[PDB]
Amino acid sequence: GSMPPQLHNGLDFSAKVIQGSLDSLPQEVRKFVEGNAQLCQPEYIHICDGSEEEYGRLLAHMQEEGVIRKLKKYDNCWLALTDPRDVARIESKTVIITQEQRDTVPIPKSGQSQLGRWMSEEDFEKAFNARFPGCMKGRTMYVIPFSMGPLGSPLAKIGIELTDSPYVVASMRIMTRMGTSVLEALGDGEFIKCLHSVGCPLPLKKPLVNNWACNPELTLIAHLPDRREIISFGSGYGGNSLLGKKCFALRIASRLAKEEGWLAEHMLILGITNPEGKKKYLAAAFPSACGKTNLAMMNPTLPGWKVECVGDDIAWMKFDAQGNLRAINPENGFFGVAPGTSVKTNPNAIKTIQKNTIFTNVAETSDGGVYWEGIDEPLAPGVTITSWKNKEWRPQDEEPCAHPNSRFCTPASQCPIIDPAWESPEGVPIEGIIFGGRRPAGVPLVYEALSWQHGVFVGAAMRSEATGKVIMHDPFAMRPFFGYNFGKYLAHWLSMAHRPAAKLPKIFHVNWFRKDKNGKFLWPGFGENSRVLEWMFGRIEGEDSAKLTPIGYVPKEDALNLKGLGDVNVEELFGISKEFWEKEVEEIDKYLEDQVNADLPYEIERELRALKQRISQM
Ligand SMILES: Nc1nc2c(ncn2[C@@H]2O[C@H](COP(=O)(O)OP(=O)(O)OP(=O)(O)O)[C@@H](O)[C@H]2O)c(=O)[nH]1
Numbered sequence: 001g002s003m004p005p006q007l008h009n010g011l012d013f014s015a016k017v018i019q020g021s022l023d024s025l026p027q028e029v030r031k032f033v034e035g036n037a038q039l040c041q042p043e044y045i046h047i048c049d050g051s052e053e054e055y056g057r058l059l060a061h062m063q064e065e066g067v068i069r070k071l072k073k074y075d076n077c078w079l080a081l082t083d084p085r086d087v088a089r090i091e092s093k094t095v096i097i098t099q100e101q102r103d104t105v106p107i108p109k110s111g112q113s114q115l116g117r118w119m120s121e122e123d124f125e126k127a128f129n130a131r132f133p134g135c136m137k138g139r140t141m142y143v144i145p146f147s148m149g150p151l152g153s154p155l156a157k158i159g160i161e162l163t164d165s166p167y168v169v170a171s172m173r174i175m176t177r178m179g180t181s182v183l184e185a186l187g188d189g190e191f192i193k194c195l196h197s198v199g200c201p202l203p204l205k206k207p208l209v210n211n212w213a214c215n216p217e218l219t220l221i222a223h224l225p226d227r228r229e230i231i232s233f234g235s236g237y238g239g240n241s242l243l244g245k246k247c248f249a250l251r252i253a254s255r256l257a258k259e260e261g262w263l264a265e266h267m268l269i270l271g272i273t274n275p276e277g278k279k280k281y282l283a284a285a286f287p288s289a290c291g292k293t294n295l296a297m298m299n300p301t302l303p304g305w306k307v308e309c310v311g312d313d314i315a316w317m318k319f320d321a322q323g324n325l326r327a328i329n330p331e332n333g334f335f336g337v338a339p340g341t342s343v344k345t346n347p348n349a350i351k352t353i354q355k356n357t358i359f360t361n362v363a364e365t366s367d368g369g370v371y372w373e374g375i376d377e378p379l380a381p382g383v384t385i386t387s388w389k390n391k392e393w394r395p396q397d398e399e400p401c402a403h404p405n406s407r408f409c410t411p412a413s414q415c416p417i418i419d420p421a422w423e424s425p426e427g428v429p430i431e432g433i434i435f436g437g438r439r440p441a442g443v444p445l446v447y448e449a450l451s452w453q454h455g456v457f458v459g460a461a462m463r464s465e466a467t468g469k470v471i472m473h474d475p476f477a478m479r480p481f482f483g484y485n486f487g488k489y490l491a492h493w494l495s496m497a498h499r500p501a502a503k504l505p506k507i508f509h510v511n512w513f514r515k516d517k518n519g520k521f522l523w524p525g526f527g528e529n530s531r532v533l534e535w536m537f538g539r540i541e542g543e544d545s546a547k548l549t550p551i552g553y554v555p556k557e558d559a560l561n562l563k564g565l566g567d568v569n570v571e572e573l574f575g576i577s578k579e580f581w582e583k584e585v586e587e588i589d590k591y592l593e594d595q596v597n598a599d600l601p602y603e604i605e606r607e608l609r610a611l612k613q614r615i616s617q618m
């Protein structure tokens, strides 16, 4: 782009560029970079090229500065340990800015919205000016050009993330497609503007914990959809700092999707092939910490079935001209929870994460490997553990060796079951959509919606045990992620039924988490969930394998393959109690009335009425 006009030499940052050229950038990309460099005052500007030489130089830089350690047991794997105040995506510090609040959340009838957190433009201006001026002093501003989706896909969109964290650059190279080829594809096109700072200008005003810069008291993750901007300050972690993932590919993208006729969803995508050589793609929305990654990478127990992974967390979907709902994974890697990952629960993740992977907040073994609760693989006599708090650790310490939200960040092209169409620009045709969460009582293993409207209500009605327990509402697994008013999002989903030629997927709801009276899981889950997927497959083919109930279709007796599982308390796992469901519909009704209020579509109110009526006839 061109040099800004100057009476002095205070606006052109060319002398501080240590990789790339401001003159090579598209005009509007130059203006974004240089305007924010003026505000944030970085010492240098590094324009990322996405090369393997860059990446290795970056990793070396962080290793020299003690920001990450090499895991010498594996091939090109690394470990970062954070400040314990900065360990997760933080919804209480996450906002969306629009002129009118109702564009962002429905105005609730009686209570405070739980469907988003609106901030006015003027309050955001104050917050921005209290944070960003001078915030990169003494640091490098990295410029990360990235594509969400295969480079060129009709469904793909480009962002530019400015950050002062080399951890963010390395993680974005895995999680997105990053570098010079993205700038060449973008040209003078539109892009999402992503600004990120850890909020710790040098010299440091406050103590640095574990070599991990953050500013918990000023953390703020903001989204300005009308300006196509995402501005995040004070956290270096996950969905707060890797701005392509939740901030772009769910919050900004769900609003662009509403504007443009598509969907952006917190869904895995998988391909499943049966023993008769037929393959189908499924999408599934479960809340965080409710097993999407385990399902997306399943190793099925049933012989002759195969599952392949297209993505594990975000889906972008659009009807094509033929009426098929086509989906892409806009991500380029998996940002998976590490604890609980074992050969029993996710053997294909175990395979994937031993090369080219960055781990955050797991334990390190003395021979340079990784450990966490639930890994279920013993260490040789002699090998010791350093916990994620950087302290010698043993099991008699009561605290976990890994933080419960610790992650791996691994390339998708390495997974041994990555689907052969996972980067197809046309996307994959979705034939079923699965909702679900953690329900210890009342909700059976699987049911099928009665109609598309009923299915949209079942997404709306989702609830899940918080991870005393509380049963939270998390409609469509999107509660922390709606880019705009949920009522309008329901209308958008309902409207897909009115598109001529639309081939609507079947909608299901699952529950892996039902417990008996003693608190034991009724269903063994994991790869045995292949039995539930086989039933859903047959359903999509029209098999006569369902029985009607008040909450939807369930498997007929004998319809699930439970060979090898004769031991299961089938009475309890599939049972439907009038008393539980009368209470459930009352909670659903109270939630939708308060939280969606004047923006609740008629058709969702009608499905609530019909479910109440069907339960009343039990
Ligand atoms: N009982 C049971 N637990 C399951 C099953 N599948 C996954 N889990 C549990 O789900 C958790 C793992 O899910 P996460 O990786 O946290 O879930 P996610 O949906 O991928 O979350 P995000 O990556 O945060 O969006 C662990 O507690 C697992 O034991 C299943 O079939 N049965």
Ligand SMILES: O=C(O)C(=O)CS(=O)(=O)O
Residues within 6 Å of the ligand: 088, 089, 237, 238, 239, 240, 245, 246, 287, 288, 313, 335
């Ligand atoms: O919280 C989630 O749903 C996640 O996938 C982790 S993060 O990307 O939000 O950090």
Ligand SMILES: [Mn+2]
Residues within 6 Å of the ligand: 292, 293, 312, 313, 335, 336, 337
């Ligand atoms: Mn996951």
Ligand SMILES: [Mn+2]
Residues within 6 Å of the ligand: 266, 288, 313
């Ligand atoms: Mn997620």
Ligand code: NA
Residues within 6 Å of the ligand: 066, 067, 068, 080, 081, 082, 083, 209, 210, 211, 212
């Ligand atoms: Na650290």
